[PDB]
Amino acid sequence: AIPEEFDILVLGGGSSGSCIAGRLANLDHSLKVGLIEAGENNLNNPWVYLPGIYPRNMKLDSKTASFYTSNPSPHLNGRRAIVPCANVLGGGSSINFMMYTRGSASDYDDFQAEGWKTKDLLPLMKKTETYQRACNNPDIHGFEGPIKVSFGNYTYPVCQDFLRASESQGIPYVDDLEDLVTAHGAEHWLKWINRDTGRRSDSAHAFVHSTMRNHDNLYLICNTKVDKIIVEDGRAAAVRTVPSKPLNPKKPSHKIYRARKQIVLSCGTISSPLVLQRSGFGDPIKLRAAGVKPLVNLPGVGRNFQDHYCFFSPYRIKPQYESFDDFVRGDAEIQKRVFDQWYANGTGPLATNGIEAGVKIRPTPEELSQMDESFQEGYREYFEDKPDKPVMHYSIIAGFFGDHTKIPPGKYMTMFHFLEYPFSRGSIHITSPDPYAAPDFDPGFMNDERDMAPMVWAYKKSRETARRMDHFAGEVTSHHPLFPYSSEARALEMDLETSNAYGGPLNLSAGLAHGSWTQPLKKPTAKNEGHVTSNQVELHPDIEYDEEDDKAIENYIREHTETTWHCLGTCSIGPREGSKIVKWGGVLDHRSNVYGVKGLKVGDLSVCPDNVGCNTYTTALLIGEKTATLVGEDLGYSGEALDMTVPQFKLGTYEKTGLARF
Amino acid sequence: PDKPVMHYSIIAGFFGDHTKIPPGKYMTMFHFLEYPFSRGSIHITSPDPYAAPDF
Numbered sequence: 001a002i003p004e005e006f007d008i009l010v011l012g013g014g015s016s017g018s019c020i021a022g023r024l025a026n027l028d029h030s031l032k033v034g035l036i037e038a039g040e041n042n043l044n045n046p047w048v049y050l051p052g053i054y055p056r057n058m059k060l061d062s063k064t065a066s067f068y069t070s071n072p073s074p075h076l077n078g079r080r081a082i083v084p085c086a087n088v089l090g091g092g093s094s095i096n097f098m099m100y101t102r103g104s105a106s107d108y109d110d111f112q113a114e115g116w117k118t119k120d121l122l123p124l125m126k127k128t129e130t131y132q133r134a135c136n137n138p139d140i141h142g143f144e145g146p147i148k149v150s151f152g153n154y155t156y157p158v159c160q161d162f163l164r165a166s167e168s169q170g171i172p173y174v175d176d177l178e179d180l181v182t183a184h185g186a187e188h189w190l191k192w193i194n195r196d197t198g199r200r201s202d203s204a205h206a207f208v209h210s211t212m213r214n215h216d217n218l219y220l221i222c223n224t225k226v227d228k229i230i231v232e233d234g235r236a237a238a239v240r241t242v243p244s245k246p247l248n249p250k251k252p253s254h255k256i257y258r259a260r261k262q263i264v265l266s267c268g269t270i271s272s273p274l275v276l277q278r279s280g281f282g283d284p285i286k287l288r289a290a291g292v293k294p295l296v297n298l299p300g301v302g303r304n305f306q307d308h309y310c311f312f313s314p315y316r317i318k319p320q321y322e323s324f325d326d327f328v329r330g331d332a333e334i335q336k337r338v339f340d341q342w343y344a345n346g347t348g349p350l351a352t353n354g355i356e357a358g359v360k361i362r363p364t365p366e367e368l369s370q371m372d373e374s375f376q377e378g379y380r381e382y383f384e385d386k387p388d389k390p391v392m393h394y395s396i397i398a399g400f401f402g403d404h405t406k407i408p409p410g411k412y413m414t415m416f417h418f419l420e421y422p423f424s425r426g427s428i429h430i431t432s433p434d435p436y437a438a439p440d441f442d443p444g445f446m447n448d449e450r451d452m453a454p455m456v457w458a459y460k461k462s463r464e465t466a467r468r469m470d471h472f473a474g475e476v477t478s479h480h481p482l483f484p485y486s487s488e489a490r491a492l493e494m495d496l497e498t499s500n501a502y503g504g505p506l507n508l509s510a511g512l513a514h515g516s517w518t519q520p521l522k523k524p525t526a527k528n529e530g531h532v533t534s535n536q537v538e539l540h541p542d543i544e545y546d547e548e549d550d551k552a553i554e555n556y557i558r559e560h561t562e563t564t565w566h567c568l569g570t571c572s573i574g575p576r577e578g579s580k581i582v583k584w585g586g587v588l589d590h591r592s593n594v595y596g597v598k599g600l601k602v603g604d605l606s607v608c609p610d611n612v613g614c615n616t617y618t619t620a621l622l623i624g625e626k627t628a629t630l631v632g633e634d635l636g637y638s639g640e641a642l643d644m645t646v647p648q649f650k651l652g653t654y655e656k657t658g659l660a661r662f
Numbered sequence: 663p664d665k666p667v668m669h670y671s672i673i674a675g676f677f678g679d680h681t682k683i684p685p686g687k688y689m690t691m692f693h694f695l696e697y698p699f700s701r702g703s704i705h706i707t708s709p710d711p712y713a714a715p716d717f
């Protein structure tokens with residue numbers, strides 16, 4: 001039922017690869033497009049389409065992730081950060097936290113490609129999603145794309161508090177932070193959730209599984225890891241593959257698919273440089289170490305790796321407030337209701353991503369003056385020039401994203417912060433011919449001195465905005481930076497009466513404190529009389545820092561940052577000779593053709609020369625449709641019907657038609 | 663020769679605030695120095711019986 005020779009191969013099941021695959025199959029119908037993926041098929045998989053069970057996908061024993069491990073680095077205090085990668089069809093779209101956001105207009109301009117300008121990509125960004133939200137800026141958001149975006153069907157009350165708290169810190173509340181022209185802001189964060197159904201909006205169901213029902217000319221080859229891309233006579237005409245799991249040691253197996261006219265790498269920013277390097281694309285010197293024969297000289301493959309630096313800081317919440325923390329804990333009685341409401345209706349806690357509100361930031365020069373002089377020096381060259389770019393982002397999660405086995409029982413609200421444009425640059429490289437062998441690579445977290453100041457400053461900022469929220473009960477001190485014990489900057493725990501409130505009536509140890517493990521939090525200043533009851537506020541004292549209280553936050557960040565999976569770079573656009581933005585030299589042409597070979601293209605999110613200050617999923621879709629359009633013109637097909645609409649039953653706004661709301 | 667310098671035992675549980683520790687079952691070691699060298703003091707600050715001494 002599967003033929004050996006596809007017309008257009010599309011390696012990878014990544015969200016970008018599903019874009020290229022779905023769009024490409026659609027343009028001709030007659031054309032035969034075969035997609036190859038190293039992972040399980042995900043059609044109608046309950047653990048994928050329903051949004052609220054996202055954290056499970058990240059477990060270490062979890063099937064759907066690869067968990068690459070980095071070489072140890074001094075900068076992380078000897079820490080060896082894991083760098084997880086998606087391993088299911090649809091890529092990370094089947095796994096992601098479903099945060100929605102969009103990068104600055106300056107970002108796409110920074111690629112400085114012959115194309116790829118924001119002015120050109122705006123319509124293409126507009127073509128790939130419908131916008132369930134009550135849009136005000138309708139000249140930018142699409143309104144009838146395959147992928148749906150909304151606020152979900154449930155809303156934790158945390159968001160209003162986070163907004164009233166952020167607004168008091170001099171951070172403006174902007175209705176749309178995805179406008180592409182903003183630094184400071186706050187918003188009720190959008191999610192990749194189909195509001196009309198409550199399902200996750202991954203690219204696979206929207207592009208691949210929606211096309212296959214409708215059209216015969218698409219082949220899905222799940223569970224076949226790519227080994228190598230055979231190339232001869234200057235054309236990339238084949239791709240030998242191996243099974244994803246080597247279950248038959250005595251007789252290893254492989255298969256060689258053929259592509260008549262085009263080939264495409266959408267394997268993600270980690271796997272892809274490896275696949276090029278196994279084919280011999282790289283430095284001959286670096287490649288002889290693995291014994292692979294160097295076919296083409298591309299030093300830039302594997303270089304210029306880039307991430308974001310998230311780190312979580314939980315704060316305990318009052319007992320009376322709602323959280324998803326007890327669902328993922330997870331109780332057998334709460335969880336039953338949480339599912340039962342979703343099947344019965346479609347609107348429940350399960351039908352929402354955890355994160356509820358968030359704040360992009362660009363520091364005031366007055367507060368910028370106290371940052372380390374190195375970062376000031378970086379700010380002048382990098383951000384001084386451009387107004388559009390945020391330096392750092394943080395949001396708020398209505399629960400604890402982490403291991404609940406290792407934290408005290410209760411309900412928490414956890415702040416999430418990720419640096420927007422880390423200066424640091426990593427690398428990656430294969431060590432062995434074997435597909436299965438783990439690459440050695442240096443993500444290079446905190447490799448550059450300049451990356452620390454914004455991190456510390458955002459912890460100092462987010463703590464203050466979590467201290468002004470109505471929900472706040474006290475920091476969880478075990479998961480906060482290790483301040484000296486007598487410091488006034490210290491992370492205080494929950495009150496005694498709240499300790500009784502969580503402990504239950506029958507506890508024999510609530511306020512009992514021996515060993516001084518934690519310090520009780522002081523009562524809030526009394527509400528003013530003579531104010532309107534709705535305007536009264538009771539508030540904790542502001543905290544202040546010294547050098548010894550800064551070193552602690554610094555060590556905290558060094559010892560607890562990790563990849564945010566916004567990884568990109570490696571194979572990237574630029575001159576073959578080299579450029580300032582890509583010191584080792586680029587490998588792609590502006591038309592996404594790999595240098596030195598004919599017929600090979602990259603659809604990965606790796607393509608980007610430099611960071612996009614937004615969650616990476618949107619650029620995945622966008623780059624996937626760029627490479628799709630490029631393949632389209634490369635085939636010589638007319639600009640008429642060059643647009644490649646997927647089948648879908650469009651639902652209107654509920655007031656336009658009666659069949660579309662929750 | 664008779665005098666121990668220090669003692670510790672073992673408690674078949676966690677003697678402390680269970681609200682502030684992750685859920686599970688623990689065995690907690692307990693150690694107390696036998697003869698601390700240090701010497702303290704105590705003194706009343708006020709005539710009132712109820713007043714807390716500084717010490």
Ligand SMILES: Cc1cc2nc3c(=O)[nH]c(=O)nc-3n(C[C@H](O)[C@H](O)[C@H](O)COP(=O)(O)OP(=O)(O)OC[C@H]3O[C@@H](n4cnc5c(N)ncnc54)[C@H](O)[C@@H]3O)c2cc1C
Pocket residue numbers: 011012013014015016017036037038039058084085086087088089090091092093095096097098099100101224225226227266267268269271272275564565566567604605606614615616617618620
């Ligand atoms: C846990 C998690 C949470 C995230 N949350 C968010 C979020 O909330 N919002 C957001 O914007 N971004 C988020 N992302 C990041 C975002 O999903 C990724 O940037 C995006 O999916 C990148 O897509 P890609 O096409 O570049 O790579 P991928 O989606 O990883 O595509 C790569 C595919 O190729 C396959 N593959 C790899 N090697 C081979 C090989 N040798 N042969 C065959 N197949 C291979 C992989 O199995 C995978 O399916 C998150 C990511 C993680 C993983």
Ligand SMILES: [Mg+2]
Pocket residue numbers: 084085086092268565567
């Ligand atoms: Mg990834």
